[PDB]
Design a protein around this ligand. Structure first.
Ligand SMILES: CCC[C@]1(C)C(=O)Nc2ccccc2C(=O)N1C
Lengths: 116, 107
């Protein structure tokens, strides 16, 4: 997918540093104390609706078939810049199960952005 | 996730069948003749783990996320076995990724 830069106005990936102290989750999250989460932001015009950067999935090709023809609700449905690929991260935290847990938590880091 | 019915207003999975004959893709797609692609529709008010950290930041007055709207989008997609004609009229059997919307959620 696309990374944000000077003059990029459409859906792209940019930095987002999560500090667990800032949101008060450091009371039960031991490690890491903060990490590079990234986020998606930017315009999703019709010529890029449903894309994942330079790729268009089969599903998105069927939606665009209906969207292009003006079929409802697809025609009126707004396209949003959202993560399309996420990565896990090893975390050390206190669970409710009465212990300190080391676990790879899914969907922690944004790897790629795309339009819905 | 949540499935749509004419009752629930929030972000849900709307059932949607697509016939390849109806859209004229049957000249290259042999099988299946049709499938439930589905889609995501519905409101995403204040009430994945990445989305949760964004909302826990959006809740407080934090500049980028405070003006960043939550959208109803697929959270899980499933592949599907397809039989189709390729570039040189060869018949290919392949599991095509991201064919079916299985679950919807807010961004
Ligand atoms: C980023 C979430 C990670 C984790 C491990 C969780 O799975 N459960 C949660 C679910 C919702 C909110 C926080 C947490 C949480 O802080 N912990 C303990």
């Amino acid at each position: 997918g696309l990374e944000c830069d000077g003059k990029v106005n459409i859906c792209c990936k940019k930095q987002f540093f999560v500090s667990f102290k800032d949101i008060g989750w450091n009371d039960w999250i031991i490690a890491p104390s903060g990490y590079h989460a990234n986020y998606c932001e930017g315009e999703c015009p019709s010529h890029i609706a449903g894309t994942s950067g330079s790729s268009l999935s089969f599903h998105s090709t069927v939606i665009n078939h209906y969207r292009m023809r003006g079929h409802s609700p697809f025609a009126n449905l707004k396209s949003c810049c959202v993560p399309t690929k996420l990565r896990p991260m090893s975390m050390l935290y206190y669970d409710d199960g009465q212990n300190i847990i080391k676990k790879d938590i899914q969907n922690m880091i944004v790897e790629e952005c795309g339009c819905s």
